[model samples]
Target: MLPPDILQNGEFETIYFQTNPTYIKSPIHIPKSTIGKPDTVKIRHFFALLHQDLVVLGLEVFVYLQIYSDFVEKYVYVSKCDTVGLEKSTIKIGKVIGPVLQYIINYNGYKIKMKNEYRTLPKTQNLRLCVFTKPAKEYLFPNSAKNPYKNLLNGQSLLRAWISIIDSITKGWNNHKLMIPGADKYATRKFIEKYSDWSEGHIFKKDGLAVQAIPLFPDDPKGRFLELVIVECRYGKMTVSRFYQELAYRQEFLLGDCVSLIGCCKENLEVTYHDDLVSTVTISEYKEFMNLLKLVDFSDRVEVSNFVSNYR
Candidate 1:
């Protein structure tokens, strides 16, 4: 009903606070704030003024303004014409309750104002809008936890798919060899020397089909990452295009003109190669499962499915 008695105490000042991320560091200059214990009329007027300014600025909130004289300092002269005691006559005051409205602005600690126009802007509407736009999804599950299959797929699923594709491709071979680190010491040394330069690129192999995998996420419309996956693979530098183009010489060029054959997963799993519009596939679609060997008229002409019972 009545304003708190803290308003009467001049030792402190009332502040309208904005709750935002801790990273922000700006001054606290709220246009919707006022000094002294004003009545309901003054409080209403403050918010009204705040609303008008925000609307004019094409802003969604209020900002910093000023303080009333009564709240700034209290005058205590002995008499009506007592200019003599003026020096000791005045006593400064503030709110014991301390700081309203702009309930509209976002300031962690400090606030800002336009030098010429005296208008205040948010430290980061970009970050604010990010929270406001999705709110629940961002709040609930962040990073890897956010994607639907992220937990299941992370790095393990990709590795499994990688091994499966290699096993399928090597199906009909008796001496065909492929290893995680591979059996070539010289090649391994050269690869480590290169990829260790920036500590990027991961290595895996299937016979002569060595690939480097780079994991990445799919971007949502708001220009933020919304999904996670093993985004690309490289046989040298050309690994990305296979993940990029569907029928664009995908397996042909990488594995060398289909001189050998490959198998593919028959089941369709929902996933994309590169583009978002290009979704719908199981792990098989993305990986060359050696089924292509059947289409090839090579001298050996080995079909991937022929040697199903092989070593891991």
Candidate 2:
């Protein structure tokens, strides 16, 4: 409600604070943010920004743009701001599936600006949207409780909602910070050693007739894709790839990989392409999954299927 009670430089000033993931030590510099200003950045409703809290759910999400000069190649999966569980690192965004994010600033925290994330320009360099835990609410869930699956999928969808809402709020918002252009490009896993083996990773076992790890057509509307990520997520101690589905109530994924949340595509990779289920990841996410194809004789021939159906 009030000017972010404390600023970074004056309030939580510290050398170590600069080193936190929130610090931007990039090679470029983005323009200043418009949060909490006269020309405030406004967006309708980001799926992740919903709550009855005071300093929180505002009528309009207007703040200076969180500026930086760093090239964000990829995002890391971390535990939520003040939560811990085998299923999700953060509770509100995933478990209950909330859109309003309660970002606590341990030190200097800035307001969110309206920027395009899927455009051609590089990511806002040297910038970060962060939260702190010292004076804020410390969130935690019991070991026996289960998070809602709809919430998890919906929570993830919030990120997409943010991307779209920002575009609608501002006329040229789509041109400013949206960088979906390169996001679909090939980000190699030759960099990653290997994804850990989990009973569940083994569960969502891809079982279709393996196809060649490649694009269906050259110079097509888009190109081929094959991506992969080191997954370490779980639904109550169970690996994520293949779970009982419906994580919230069932605490498992659709009876055992029977269904998918449709979100988390940022981490999940699709190596093959089909005539129907073509998605945005067909450009980048699939390319990452192809890394796994490299190990097999049919790098370009393995079809990643909803392969595991023992439970269903």
Candidate 3:
């Protein structure tokens, strides 16, 4: 999460979330004096080199910063973008370019500041470049039935149920079969499919239903597994423990699927960027994420209210 102070201070108009730990270092090798004076060609080459580096990483984004005599312009780069992906990449790219921006500010002794008024650009030294990414198509959610099980359990009961389910499912699987170093692929697939189907049926109380009527899992296999575990925990039926334990044993299969799960579970709660350019990146922690959203929402509202009052 970005520090609250930095976000509130308006040092950045946008921020990006980075999943991987790699940091893009400064590629600009021009003399400190040349960078401070700001030649158009050097500045253009600087952005071009940055874009080239991003391209080499197979990341489909572009970035540039332009400082004109009167104002500054920042461009964000993106490709094949969806709203969520673009928002995610925007913040991600913001993280990427932040250090470089600061470096430039430090070297040139430019006084970088953002005015509180509407539609005003960042104040900076004389130069001109604008960073832009292709506008993304509006993201639309698939119309689907709400999860019936979302409110089925809560608080201590939920915790107790969760623990019991985890225990029961872990104990029920046959230790020898799972322990087999060279397990049969067909048998394993069948076993997992059977459990998944059984779990769904147990939760929804449907027989041989192809499409999910209650829609507990949507497109996520991990969500399906989680729902299955929940049902098995509730009813204490079958040795779901063994299957659940097996899933835990195969940890690699479960690592990268939670983001979709979060999206499916809380589709109404969006981590969106605003037109005001005060944007918040996505974070998984519910409280922190909501706080960021509130900050952005509050800032936007303040901008609107102030504009209306001034007009009046």
Candidate 4:
């Protein structure tokens, strides 16, 4: 029999949206003439927007960095954005929430399906973008050919970009270490004494439910930081796999009809955008699909042949 777990299907929506890979060439093409001087620092900036999803507040979140190269210099930092003073990156991420809304199930056993628009800030010449979610799976081994070899989904954009920028703007960093003044002080007094109560609000809240219960943002100390935090969890009496698809069906929180989602993007990096309410009926079908897979070990061993045979 299946493990002791209780979930209907997956969640009410497609957990995340991935952008089309640019598959840029290595030693990225940066204009030396743009800076007009040698050994000078120039930060290139862009502002892009994305449709929203509350997954940013969840635990199983990963901001995947895609780089291509020629088997030489490896660079991962290609985009850069700052969330220094904003209370919640959701509010300043320049991400526009559209007409439709969806229910957001939080780990705190609080579920409110509402709707709204949250605009985030922009990224400098060193553009930074983010995505967040607490992963259902313990590890994120995606379906791509980038793991081995040169990691050249296209070959090495990170290294190329850096090379070009260095020649033009002097040596610079992508996703460079940021100094988040209030973020680290979530539990410390020395850090708190420096900022106001409102400033503290801009920081994250542990909430003790999941890893990320705040906006998608950079931590004051370390981590491949961003303004997004995606959570992945399975509460209640049901025993399901930590992997996402497996946990969507067995929800610990009963959600109301009204739910809201907030998508994020820097000043203008939105490659393609669609924002609106993902209906309950749609969420229902999506969850059903999840319930059908990912919750068990050696999933192929599960009995789907009998079930598939009955479809006729």
My TM-score estimates for the predictions, one after another, are 0.13, 0.19, 0.17, 0.20
lDDT of 3 by residue, 43-75 (tens): 111211111112101122222333334433222
- In model 3, which regions exceed 4 Å deviation? 1-5, 13-222, 228-236, 249-312
Per candidate, the number of residue pairs that clash is 29, 74, 18, 79
Put down candidate 4 lDDT per residue, 128-170, tens digits, no spaces: 3222111112121121122222122111222222222222221
lDDT of 1 by residue, 57-172 (tens): 00112122222222211010000000011012122111110112112211222222233222222222111100011111121111222232222222223333323433333233
Between candidates 1 and 3, the TM-score winner: 3
**Model 2 residue 155 lDDT score:** 26
Q: Residue 93 of model 1: what lDDT?
A: 14
lDDT of 2: 0.20
Model 2 lDDT per residue over 145-257, tens place: 23222122232233343333222322321111211111111221111113221011111114321111111122111111111111332212322312212122231221222
Please give the CA lDDT of all the candidate structures: 0.20, 0.20, 0.26, 0.21
Residue 130, candidate 3: Cα error in Å is 41
| Cα error of candidate 2 at position 63, Å | 11
Q: Which regions of candidate 2 are displaced past 4 Å?
A: 1-145, 148-150, 154-159, 168-312
